[PDB]
Amino acid sequence: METVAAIKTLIQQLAQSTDQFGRAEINDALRELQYSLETPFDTVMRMSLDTCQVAVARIGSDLGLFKHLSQCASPQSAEELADHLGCGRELMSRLLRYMASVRMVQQTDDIKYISSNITQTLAVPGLEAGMRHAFENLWPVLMALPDFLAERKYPDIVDAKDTAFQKAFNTDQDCFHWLATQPTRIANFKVLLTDERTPNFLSTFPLEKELGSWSAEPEKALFVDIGGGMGHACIRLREKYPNQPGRVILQDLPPVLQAAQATLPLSGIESMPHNFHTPQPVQGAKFYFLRLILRDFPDHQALEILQNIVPAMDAESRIVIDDGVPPEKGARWAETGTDICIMSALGSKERTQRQWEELAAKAGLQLQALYQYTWPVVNAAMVFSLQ
Amino acid sequence: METVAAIKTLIQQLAQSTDQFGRAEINDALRELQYSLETPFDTVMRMSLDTCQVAVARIGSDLGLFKHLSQCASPQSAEELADHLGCGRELMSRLLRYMASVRMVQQTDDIKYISSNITQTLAVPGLEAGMRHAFENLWPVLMALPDFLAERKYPDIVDAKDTAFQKAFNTDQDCFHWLATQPTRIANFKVLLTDERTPNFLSTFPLEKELGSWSAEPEKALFVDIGGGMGHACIRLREKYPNQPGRVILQDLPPVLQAAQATLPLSGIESMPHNFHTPQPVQGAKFYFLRLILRDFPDHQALEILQNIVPAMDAESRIVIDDGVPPEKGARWAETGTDICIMSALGSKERTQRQWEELAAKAGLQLQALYQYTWPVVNAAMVFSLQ
Numbered sequence: 001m002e003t004v005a006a007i008k009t010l011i012q013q014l015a016q017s018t019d020q021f022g023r024a025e026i027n028d029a030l031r032e033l034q035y036s037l038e039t040p041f042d043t044v045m046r047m048s049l050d051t052c053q054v055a056v057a058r059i060g061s062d063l064g065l066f067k068h069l070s071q072c073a074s075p076q077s078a079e080e081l082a083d084h085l086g087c088g089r090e091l092m093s094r095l096l097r098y099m100a101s102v103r104m105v106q107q108t109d110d111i112k113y114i115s116s117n118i119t120q121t122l123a124v125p126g127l128e129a130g131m132r133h134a135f136e137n138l139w140p141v142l143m144a145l146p147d148f149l150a151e152r153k154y155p156d157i158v159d160a161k162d163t164a165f166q167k168a169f170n171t172d173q174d175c176f177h178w179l180a181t182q183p184t185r186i187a188n189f190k191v192l193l194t195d196e197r198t199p200n201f202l203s204t205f206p207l208e209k210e211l212g213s214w215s216a217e218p219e220k221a222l223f224v225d226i227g228g229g230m231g232h233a234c235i236r237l238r239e240k241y242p243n244q245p246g247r248v249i250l251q252d253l254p255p256v257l258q259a260a261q262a263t264l265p266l267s268g269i270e271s272m273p274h275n276f277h278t279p280q281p282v283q284g285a286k287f288y289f290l291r292l293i294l295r296d297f298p299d300h301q302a303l304e305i306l307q308n309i310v311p312a313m314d315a316e317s318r319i320v321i322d323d324g325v326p327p328e329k330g331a332r333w334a335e336t337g338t339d340i341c342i343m344s345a346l347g348s349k350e351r352t353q354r355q356w357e358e359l360a361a362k363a364g365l366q367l368q369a370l371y372q373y374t375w376p377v378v379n380a381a382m383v384f385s386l387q
Numbered sequence: 388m389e390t391v392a393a394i395k396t397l398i399q400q401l402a403q404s405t406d407q408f409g410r411a412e413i414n415d416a417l418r419e420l421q422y423s424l425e426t427p428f429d430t431v432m433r434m435s436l437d438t439c440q441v442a443v444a445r446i447g448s449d450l451g452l453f454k455h456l457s458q459c460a461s462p463q464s465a466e467e468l469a470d471h472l473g474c475g476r477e478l479m480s481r482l483l484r485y486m487a488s489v490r491m492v493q494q495t496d497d498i499k500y501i502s503s504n505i506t507q508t509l510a511v512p513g514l515e516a517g518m519r520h521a522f523e524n525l526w527p528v529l530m531a532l533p534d535f536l537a538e539r540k541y542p543d544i545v546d547a548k549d550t551a552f553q554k555a556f557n558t559d560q561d562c563f564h565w566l567a568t569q570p571t572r573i574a575n576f577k578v579l580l581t582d583e584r585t586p587n588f589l590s591t592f593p594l595e596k597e598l599g600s601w602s603a604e605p606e607k608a609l610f611v612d613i614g615g616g617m618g619h620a621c622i623r624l625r626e627k628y629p630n631q632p633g634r635v636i637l638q639d640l641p642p643v644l645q646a647a648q649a650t651l652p653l654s655g656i657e658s659m660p661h662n663f664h665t666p667q668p669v670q671g672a673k674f675y676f677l678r679l680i681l682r683d684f685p686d687h688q689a690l691e692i693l694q695n696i697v698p699a700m701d702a703e704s705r706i707v708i709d710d711g712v713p714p715e716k717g718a719r720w721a722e723t724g725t726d727i728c729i730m731s732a733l734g735s736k737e738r739t740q741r742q743w744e745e746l747a748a749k750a751g752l753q754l755q756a757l758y759q760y761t762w763p764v765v766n767a768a769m770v771f772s773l774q
């Protein structure tokens with residue numbers, strides 16, 4: 001129709017006329033519109049069929065299809081793709097028709113196939129690893145959650161060793177320990193750590209204001225990245241503030257510090273092995289930084305992580321929690337969906353600002369400031385002090 | 388933003404100004420815009436989390452939440468919903484926050500919850516049974532499809548007894564035979580038959596023109612509804628053409644014929660047990676009607692169903708296949724997602740018009756006419772004859 005093409009042109013121009021935050025708001029609006037305009041039968045069909053996207057992406061990842069197509073300068077027919085990748089000719093045709101219909105690939109007028117934005121996305125190793133994670137680790141736990149809750153008469157999950165994960169994988173270990181005994185899952189998890197989210201807290205964090213008159217002399221630590229993974233926060237901080245004095249220290253487990261050496265700068269950033277369930281060794285640091293750490297633990301273990309940092313803090317020291325802060329109402333699907341997944345797999349939860357302050361007050365901490373850096377799904381650097 | 392409120396208002400106004408087929412066109416466009424405007428991270432996030440909708444709908448169905456909430460005139464808080472339904476208060480709060488973020492319920496400004504269009508949909512018994520089918524039957528099969536295809540080096544699936552269903556449910560039976568041994572699944576499937584798709588083929592089927600000079604005397608059958616389920620097509624046939632003479636015969640297995648006696652009209656429609664894998668007993672009927680039957684069977688088994696009807700046809704007899712007819716290009720997600728699902732669970736496929744004629748030709752049949760009655764996802768009544 002001419003009406004739908006005018007809608008498309010119009011929303012495209014609006015999207016190009018705003019920033020990434022405006023586009024994310026428009027995308028949420030398009031989603032709400034779809035749900036409001038669908039027939040009752042469309043609703044059931046949508047819930048049933050959108051499940052195929054992860055399964056079909058997983059297949060195409062297994063075949064190298066997205067990485068392959070991303071490197072093609074000319075449209076590819078189904079037959080030449082089936083033959084180059086080792087897939088049955090009829091199976092490939094059907095996968096591609098489904099993929100094109102959800103824009104996983106683009107289909108041409110002569111029934112050939114080029115890459116779309118999603119094809120390029122699924123070719124990026126860190127992002128492909130997120131999709132594979134969702135298939136092999138998230139799906140079994142979501143599949144087990146409804147019968148788990150029914151057998152337990154619908155409890156409030158607060159224990160990482162008593163959730164749907166234990167039923168889904170027939171184990172009594174928590175997810176973290178169980179993952180170490182699985183080599184193929186660790187390999188995908190290692191690639192997941194190389195994906196860097198953008199934007200990051202340094203786009204709005206007023207470091208010079210939060211610094212105040214704090215002195216790095218003699219050799220105090222400016223930034224202690226606790227569970228910092230590949231050290232992306234450390235790297236970005238030195239990049240944005242190359243003249244600010246103080247040690248910048250990456251803290252994680254020895255296996256991931258070794259992997260992080262491939263991409264760390266030759267100097268500037270220290271690598272310090274540390275299990276954050278043990279007392280913090282670095283004393284008097286200005287910023288103790290926890291990005292997407294505490295979300296992965298129930299309140300009682302998340303508190304224990306904080307209590308292990310408190311004894312090392314001066315009056316000028318701050319604990320910076322960089323994590324989701326969903327609002328008390330109007331929370332979006334990306335910050336409530338995650339809440340259901342980590343409940344089912346880790347026994348943890350997303351936390352509103354109020355729940356973050358209540359958790360922190362138990363460790364003797366007080367919220368000094370909150371600096372949001374994504375919208376409309378809230379990620380914020382929360383700055384906590386003592387007293 | 389004011390911008391997204393204006394987008395919603397405008398697309399709502401457009402959606403009300405058109406028919407259901409126009410609304411479906413707009414919805415597909417909104418989906419395409421959403422996928423094209425998401426960031427790479429959004430894409431992975433969407434694939435990871437849209438899974439939760441099926442799991443959470445299953446939980447709400449288990450608790451009776453959607454049926455209960457559809458009967459409430461005033462908004463309900465999480466605490467009172469949790470108490471009435473026997474669910475943890477915190478668990479219920481997190482379920483409701485997730486559901487509200489995907490319009491499964493509606494959240495109010497005072498953080499209470501009321502029904503949405505989707506809440507009402509999930510309260511309808513046949514549509515709830517469709518969602519429950521997707522959870523317990525479909526996506527175990529989808530969870531098994533990638534490893535199944537990888538182990539088998541990506542074959543063309545053509546056999547109902549050698550597909551992802553056998554690995555998902557650790558059986559050697561095909562899906563239909565296995566289902567008959569599962570009482571809880573059969574019950575849900577029985578409820579699923581109560582849902583009547585709308586619109587139906589009688590909205591565009593020119594009965595009188597196709598009938599022509601056909602004579603019902605002595606006692607020929609006008610309409611034989613093969614695998615007709617609850618008999619919805621028979622009922623709507625008698626409602627729209629009450630004066631048309633000829634028998635109208637509902638053919639199905641005794642279990643569903645028995646369950647269909649509740650909603651069948653007292654007279655007009657005969658109930659005749661018949662297994663469509665055996666020769667057709669009604670001789671010389673005008674219309675042999677197969678709605679959403681042959682889509683569930685691979686080519687060789689679909690052909691046997693037709694080969695069993697051909698020997699009972701007159702020159703005036705027609706076989707009417709009412710089923711999906713996807714296009715050769717530009718097929719929609721609702722007709723390609725079904726294809727992947729039935730491939731994985733039943734070894735069957737969706738069929739273009741060309742594949743339907745190829746299959747019918749092998750039974751001695753010839754396409755006479757094709758009457759679409761849905762758009763843009765195509766369902767049509769295809770009229771076949773001998774020679």
Ligand SMILES: C[S@@+](CC[C@H](N)C(=O)[O-])C[C@H]1O[C@@H](n2cnc3c(N)ncnc32)[C@H](O)[C@@H]1O
Nearest residue numbers: 227228229232252253256274275276277291292
């Ligand atoms: C979400 S991942 C990395 C997130 C990282 N802070 C970022 O935003 O870039 C969580 C990190 O915590 C680390 N981790 C898990 N358990 C730990 C422990 N007991 N001690 C220190 N680090 C741990 C993991 O190695 C992983 O790198």
Ligand SMILES: C[S@@+](CC[C@H](N)C(=O)[O-])C[C@H]1O[C@@H](n2cnc3c(N)ncnc32)[C@H](O)[C@@H]1O
Nearest residue numbers: 614615616619639640643661662663664678679
């Ligand atoms: C798609 S469902 C019902 C479709 C129905 N024609 C409609 O559109 O309303 C398939 C139907 O075929 C019936 N069926 C399955 N196997 C059969 C068989 N071997 N013989 C006769 N009916 C069968 C089931 O009982 C079920 O009612």
Ligand SMILES: C[C@@H]1CCC[C@H]2C=C[C@@H](C)[C@]3(C(=O)NC=C(c4ccccc4)C3=O)[C@@H]12
Nearest residue numbers: 130133137138175296337338341342345435
């Ligand atoms: C990190 C990934 C990144 C891609 C997918 C995301 C989905 C939400 C949670 C599901 C995340 C999250 O936010 N935190 C940790 C878990 C997790 C879930 C199960 C097992 C192990 C970890 C997650 O997947 C998150």
Ligand SMILES: C[C@@H]1CCC[C@H]2C=C[C@@H](C)[C@]3(C(=O)NC=C(c4ccccc4)C3=O)[C@@H]12
Nearest residue numbers: 045048517518520521524562725728729732
């Ligand atoms: C009818 C249901 C109603 C709710 C879900 C729908 C989406 C997938 C299809 C595939 C449906 C469909 O349209 N056709 C056949 C199956 C099916 C799959 C496995 C076993 C038995 C049936 C389906 O669930 C369809």
